[PDB]
Amino acid sequence: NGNINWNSPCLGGMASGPCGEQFKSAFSCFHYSTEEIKGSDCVDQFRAMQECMQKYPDLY
Amino acid sequence: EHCGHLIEAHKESMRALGFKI
């Protein structure tokens, strides 16, 4: 797999809430890649994380 | 240890992509 293990402090606080899966999906898509930039091949997951968290400031 | 050693890069990369895409 190569997964994150989501108990890690403050990363776990983004891997949570309404948009937690957008963090799971974005940061796993990046960690599976390691090309050059955070999600250079994955931008739709990080875009969904913006598109989700732009609804929710401090809600979770 | 402190909380979130990659967390500014989490927030600021999703902001930078929030401007770029």
From Swiss-Prot, chain A:
Where in this protein would one find the motif Cx9C motif 2, according to its record?
A: 42-52
Which keywords does this chain's UniProt record carry? Disulfide bond, Mitochondrion, Oxidoreductase, Protein transport, Redox-active center, Translocation, Transport
The cellular location(s) given in this protein's UniProt record come to:
Mitochondrion intermembrane space
- Tissue and organ distribution: Expressed in all tissues tested, suggesting an ubiquitous expression.
Q: Where is the CHCH domain?
A: 16-60
Q: Kindly list the GO molecular function terms attached to this UniProt entry.
A: protein-disulfide reductase activity
Copy the domain comment.
Answer: The CHCH domain contains a conserved twin Cys-X(9)-Cys motif which is required for import and stability of MIA40 in mitochondria.
Annotated function:
Central component of a redox-sensitive mitochondrial intermembrane space import machinery which is required for the biogenesis of respiratory chain complexes. Functions as chaperone and catalyzes the formation of disulfide bonds in substrate proteins, such as COX17, COX19, MICU1 and COA7. Required for the import and folding of small cysteine-containing proteins (small Tim) in the mitochondrial intermembrane space (IMS). Required for the import of COA7 in the IMS. Precursor proteins to be imported into the IMS are translocated in their reduced form into the mitochondria.
Q: What is this protein called?
A: Mitochondrial intermembrane space import and assembly protein 40
Question: What gene is this protein a product of?
Answer: CHCHD4
Give the shown range, full length included.
46 to 105 of 142
